[PDB]
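Would you kindly consider the sequence and fold I have copied below?
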Amino acid sequence: GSSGSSGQNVLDLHGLHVDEALEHLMRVLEKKTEEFKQNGGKPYLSVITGRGNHSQGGVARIKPAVIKYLISHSFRFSEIKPGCLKVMLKSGPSSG
């Protein structure tokens, strides 16, 4: 319905290289949570690794790595869509 605070909350990984996608997931995990605490947004973050591609080849192999990195940092996430991943941003201190 109504609209909320500005700023992208969904990060699209599909299209980039496993290496890139990963690094991005980390840079966005901290860069995103920033505004989340500064302003105030959803405690989670949308991340699209890729969908449909598999049909032909979908050899992206991005989700595989992402999932591995997540579990490592004990990052809680749920699968609501066959092409989306909901992750719960971890809370903590602030820049200042």
